[PDB]
From a paper:
ADPribosylation or phosphoribosylation of Arg42 in Ub impairs the conventional ubiquitination machinery because activation by E1, trans‐thioesterification to E2, and E3‐mediated discharge from the E2 were shown to be compromised upon the introduction of the modification by Legionella ligase SdeA. In addition, residue 72 is crucial for determining Ub‐like specific recognition by E1, where for Ub this residue is an arginine, for Nedd8 it is an alanine, and for SUMO‐family members it is either a glutamate or glutamine residue.
This yeast homolog of Uba1 has a conserved overall structure with high sequence identity (68 %) in the active adenylation domain compared to human Uba1. The guanidinium groups of Arg42 and Arg72 show well‐defined electron densities, indicative of their fixed placement in a single conformation, necessary for binding to the adenylation domain of Uba1. c electron density map and the B factors of the guanidinium groups of the arginine residues suggest that Arg42 and Arg72 remain in a more rigid conformation, as part of the binding interface with the Uba1 adenylation domain, compared to Arg74 and Arg54. The B factors of the CZ atom of the guanidium groups of Arg42, Arg54, Arg72, and Arg74 of Ub are 38.5, 63.7, 30, and 55.9 Å2, respectively. Furthermore, we observe a weak electron density for the guanidinium groups of Arg54 and Arg74 in this structure, indicating flexibility and the possibility for these residues to adopt multiple conformations. It became apparent that both me‐ADPr and Pr modification of positions 72 and 42 completely abolished formation of the Ub‐Gly76‐ MESNa thioester, whereas the same modifications at positions 54 and 74 had no effect since efficient thioester formation was observed. It became apparent that changes in the chemical properties of the Arg42 and Arg72 guanidinium groups were tolerated since changing them to azides only slowed down E1‐mediated thioester formation, but did not completely abolish the activity.
Numbering used by the authors:
A (entry chain B): 1 to 76
B (entry chain A): 12 to 786, 795 to 1024
């Protein structure tokens, strides 16, 4: 299935995934496309942060779902 | 009509010059000065528009003080607009704040560019005002907050132009090939970072001449390392070279009127876990106005079920009139509507700050064309902030007014919950942008105003002028004072209930102040809140909160971006549990020899600035005052070749007047930008080739050209001016006034009389090409040359301390000129002082809008701490970028769990506590006996105290020592007297002899 990952910059990333894919595996597809190490990826969907060791289906992520790649910021 | 950097520096890096120039031509009108209006007005006046006009003829009531921080109890009965005007004016002297006495005549709206209608304007009037604005070319924004609910509406007219949708730096990249079909291949593994539909221009593409003329090409992405631009056959045939630069094209976007959007709204969602509630609240907010019409302008009564059932009827009726809102067979969410009714009179600081920040930014978008406007409706609720009604029952008695400023917070949460807020004990780490917003919210909440509560806020920073644009508790007359003290004073003025309840400290929070912030201090606290501007300070507080088991409210911003995070003992992971992107590393060879970005020349110039004017001076001073310095340098230095040479230079070529400093700077110019370049070109000529036959100077390697000094070149001139002035500073030489501008002719006469040594190659010098590649009588040559310190008695150099925010001190002047000269060498586009200041000074973009919004979200999580919520699903980490605008929330991550010997433990919050300065042997014994653990390793920070591979000789020394003595043995220096606790880390094997992860140890001395 096709899902989308939107970054805090507004960039959209299109990924081909399966419901049983692990978050670890989705993050590596993001690393291929964006060059972002999985360690630094914060993925949130429908009020949940996606954790390594779970699958897309554990979070009920569907065809055409949009995930958000978010960041913590150091200013204050 | 030019922008004041000294005031707008941090915000200028967020918005840019064009946006702010256009903002400063815009007159804004805000209708209503309850909490929402004053918060919008605050952020907009700070931002800097041409004028702010406020309209609120309503008399102040006590309940208005729930969120209107510029109202005092003395002001009751007087007009909100009149009373608020003077305090808004103090925020920015550049921004006249006027009061509109009457709005009976709606054609008065024609003199404003942006009109904001807050909760004081009926929907009927909003539709009329919006129609006038829409049909007249006036930007219209509305917002209203109801308890824990809120919304905003944006209508920027028929043809609004967005000049920049994100404010992100344009992508750029080096081209390796462009095929005739337009397939653009990137250099090596460089990522273009582009998106389909992006536009790019080109420079330096040889073979495709007119491809470089600034024509835009639409991007079709072909994976991370290639994209297509359409056929280029007609432009020629690619040879080599090329840099693409992304271009943001303008975008015309059309908005519908309020009336149209009431029946067919376009939503931007605030929380995708709640996207279904937007349409429900869209009807609910309209029904509230219909209720007011039926009830003489009165909203539903607090916690009143009768009025709530009427509002459900009104929403049900409205659904039929507006069928497109909910869609077919979607029922009214009656529990949600009931809560809107129950909370309609609520006035919640966190919600008002959330919408005050975002709406204020939307105003700035309307004034400038910068960022993507909200299009067009957004609804928000923080219902998770409600405490469990079992703990704090909500009914008509518990929520009734008691004739206090908190009545409309009581309306939502109840009296007892407000009391628990008052009696809370909280620690605020930081008193800057977030700190000021945080204290303002805590004053509105009455947090720590009870007898059993208090606020401690600490910040060692003093107030500076660049603070004032986003730290609104500080006035120009406060520059130089302590932030925490001035801020505590400010919020006590806002809410006298905090008089004598804020303890303002000026101490850093770090390992060096643990005697001040001791066990007793932390153990009294209910929770901790960060208001910090770096990661290290956050990491330290996180570790403290983990150790002491205190909840921590975390937040940060970067321009329009922001985030919040909650850390709950024994529930969530901590701040340190996750990792943030590190700052990029520039290869040393890129900095040394092969720069291709201005960031490279600025870093190179900043390092040269430190060497010339700071390190050089410190080294000289120590050589003079330290008997053992020289051999130490030989025995302890990365670069003894240069450290010794610097001292020889600094003392053999001493200046005796300013002219000598000018000569020195002119000669450094020749060395850095002429000689050293010719040397590099001698090692690698323009047309040199690598072994595979390719050109050496390609891609990231740009063949430099030596500079011929030209005092009429701005960078050549100011390199000499700044370099000489800082040389003079080092040596105590007086320049020709510091507020006087330099004269080109006076410098020219000096330099013209100079004989500039010709360059002669060193034919033996290796130049390293890649970082992963290879690279003492000659030194005795240096040490013998050094002059005897006794000859130079009393002589000292005055080292420069880099201060980026003093435009008179020549620091950024030098780094700018120095960077740009190297840019000229390598044909990199130069940068001005403001951009160089941004990079060299490591300035974090900041604006009051994001700061306020993020602070609002923290104070909506704060409510959950008060109720000691243990269900992790109720907490919300927040993520924001107002430029888009994007809002997203996530459930915090549960702390990881572990097991040893079939015992379960929390890998973050659990620890072994042991009473007394136990002996190592007893510790080892205690763990095998009571925990089933064989200690294989034991450390105190950096020191290894014990390992089970230690030989019996080493064991005998150690197995008998109390921990404090065992630490002394390894570290020599021992435990300070005040320390009452020691954290030890252990590795250990389980009963099966298998290594197991295990909690840390706390020694209670």
């Amino acid at each position: 299935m096709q899902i989308f990952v939107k970054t805090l910059t507004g960039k959209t990333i299109t990924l081909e995934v399966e419901s049983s894919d692990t978050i670890d595996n989705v993050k590596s597809k993001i690393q291929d496309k964006e060059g972002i190490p999985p360690d630094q990826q914060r993925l949130i969907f429908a009020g949940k942060q996606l954790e390594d060791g779970r699958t897309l289906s554990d979070y009920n992520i569907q065809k055409e779902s949009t995930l958000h790649l978010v960041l913590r910021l150091r200013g204050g | 009509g030019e922008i004041d950097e000294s005031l707008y520096s941090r915000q200028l890096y967020v918005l840019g010059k064009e946006a702010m120039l256009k903002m400063q031509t815009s007159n804004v009108l805000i209708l209503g000065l309850k909490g929402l209006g004053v918060e919008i007005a605050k952020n907009v006046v700070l931002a800097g528009v041409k004028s702010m006009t406020v309209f609120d003829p309503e008399p102040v009531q006590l309940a208005d003080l729930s969120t209107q921080f510029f109202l005092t109890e003395k002001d009751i009965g007087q007009k909100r607009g009149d009373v608020t005007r003077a305090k808004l004016a103090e925020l920015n002297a550049y921004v006249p704040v006027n009061v509109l006495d009457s709005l009976d005549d709606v054609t008065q709206l024609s003199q404003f560019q942006v009109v904001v209608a807050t909760d004081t304007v009926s929907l009927e009037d909003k539709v009329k005002i919006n129609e006038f604005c829409h049909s007249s070319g006036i930007r219209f924004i509305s917002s209203e907050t109801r308890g824990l609910f809120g919304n905003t509406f944006v209508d920027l007219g028929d043809e609004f132009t967005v000049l920049d949708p994100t404010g992100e730096e344009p992508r750029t990249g080096m081209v390796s090939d462009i095929e005739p079909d337009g397939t653009v291949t990137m250099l090596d593994d460089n990522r273009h970072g582009l998106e389909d539909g992006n536009f790019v221009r080109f420079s330096e593409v040889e073979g495709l001449d007119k491809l470089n003329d600034g024509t835009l090409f639409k991007v079709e992405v072909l994976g991370p390392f290639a994209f297509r631009i359409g056929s280029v056959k007609e432009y020629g045939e690619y040879k080599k070279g090329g840099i693409f630069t992304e271009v943001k094209v303008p975008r015309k976007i059309s908005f519908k009127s309020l009336k149209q959007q009431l029946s067919n709204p376009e939503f931007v969602f605030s929380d995708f876990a709640k996207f279904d509630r937007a349409a429900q609240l869209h009807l609910g907010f309209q029904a509230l106005h219909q209720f007011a019409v039926r009830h003489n302008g009165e909203l539903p009564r607090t916690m009143n079920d009768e009025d709530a059932n009427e509002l459900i009827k009104l929403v049900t009726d409205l659904s039929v009139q507006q069928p497109e809102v909910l869609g077919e067979g979607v029922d009214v969410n009656e529990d949600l509507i009931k809560e809107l009714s129950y909370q309609a009179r609520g006035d919640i600081p966190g919600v008002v700050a959330f919408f005050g920040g975002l709406v204020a930014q939307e105003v700035l978008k309307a004034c400038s064309g910068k960022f993507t406007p909200l299009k067009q409706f957004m609804y928000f609720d923080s219902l998770e902030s409600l405490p469990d009604p079992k703990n704090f029952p909500r009914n008509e008695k518990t929520t009734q007014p008691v004739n206090s400023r908190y009545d409309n917070q009581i309306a939502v949460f109840g009296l007892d919950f407000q009391k628990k807020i008052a009696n809370s004990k909280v620690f605020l780490v930081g008193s800057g942008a977030i700190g000021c917003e945080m204290l303002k919210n805590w004053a509105l909440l009455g947090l720590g105003s009870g007898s059993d509560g208090y606020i401690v806020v600490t910040d060692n920073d003093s107030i500076e002028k660049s603070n004032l644009n986003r730290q609104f508790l500080f006035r120009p007359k406060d520059v130089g004072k302590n932030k925490s003290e001035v801020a505590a004073e400010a919020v006590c003025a806002m809410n006298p209930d905090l008089k004598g309840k804020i303890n303002a400290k000026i101490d850093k929070v770090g390992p060096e102040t643990e005697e001040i912030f001791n066990d007793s201090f932390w153990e009294s606290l209910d929770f901790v809140t960060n208001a910090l501007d770096n990661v290290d300070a956050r990491t330290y507080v996180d570790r403290r909160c983990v150790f002491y088991r205190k909840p921590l409210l975390e937040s940060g911003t970067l321009g329009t971006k922001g985030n919040t995070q909650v850390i709950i003992p024994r529930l969530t992971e901590s701040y340190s549990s996750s990792r943030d992107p590190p700052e990029k590393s520039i290869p040393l060879c890129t900095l040394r020899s092969f720069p291709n970005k201005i960031d490279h020349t600025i870093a190179w110039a900043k390092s040269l600035f430190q060497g010339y004017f700071t390190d050089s001076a410190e080294n000289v001073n120590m050589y003079l005052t330290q008997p053992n310095f020289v051999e130490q340098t030989l025995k302890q230095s990365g670069d003894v070749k240069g450290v010794l040479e610097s001292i020889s230079d600094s003392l053999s070529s001493k200046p005796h007047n300013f002219e000598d400093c000018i000569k020195w700077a002119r000669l450094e110019f020749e060395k850095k930008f002429n000689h050293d370049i010719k040397q590099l070109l001698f090692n690698f000529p323009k047309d040199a080739k690598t072994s595979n036959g390719e050109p050496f100077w390609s891609g990231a390697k740009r063949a430099p050209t030596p500079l011929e000094f030209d005092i009429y070149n701005n960078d050549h001139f100011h390199f000499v001016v700044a370099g000489a002035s800082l040389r003079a500073y080092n040596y105590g030489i007086k320049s020709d006034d510091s507020n006087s501008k330099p004269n080109v002719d006076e410098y020219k006469s000096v330099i013209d009389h100079m004989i500039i040594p010709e360059f002669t190659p060193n034919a033996n010098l290796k130049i390293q090409v890649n970082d992963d590649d290879p690279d003492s009588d000659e030194i005795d040559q240096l040490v013998s040359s050094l002059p005897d310190p006794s000859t130079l008695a009393g002589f000292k150099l005055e080292p420069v301390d880099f201060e980026k925010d003093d435009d008179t001190n020549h620091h950024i002047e030098f780094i700018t000129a120095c960077s740009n000269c190297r840019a000229q060498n390598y044909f990199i586009e130069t940068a001005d002082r403001q951009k160089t200041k941004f990079i060299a000074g490591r300035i974090i973009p900041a604006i009051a809008t994001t700061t306020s919004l993020v602070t609002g979200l923290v104070n909506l999580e704060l409510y959950k701490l008060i109720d000691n919520k243990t269900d992790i699903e109720q907490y919300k980490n927040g993520f924001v970028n107002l430029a888009l605008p994007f809002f997203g929330f996530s459930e915090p991550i549960a702390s990881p769990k572990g097991e040893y010997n079939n015992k379960k433990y929390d890998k973050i919050w659990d620890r072994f506590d042991i009473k007394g300065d136990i002996k190592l042997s007893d510790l080892i014994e205690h763990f095998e006996k009571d925990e089933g653990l064989e200690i294989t390793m034991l450390s105190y920070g950096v020191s290894l105290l014990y390992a089970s591979f230690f030989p019996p000789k080493k064991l005998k020394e150690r197995l008998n020592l109390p921990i404090t003595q065992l630490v002394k043995l390894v570290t020599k220096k021992d435990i300070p007297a005040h320390v009452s606790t020691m954290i030890l880390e252990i590795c250990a094997d389980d009963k099966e002899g298998e290594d197991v992860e295990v909690p840390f140890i706390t020694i209670h001395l």
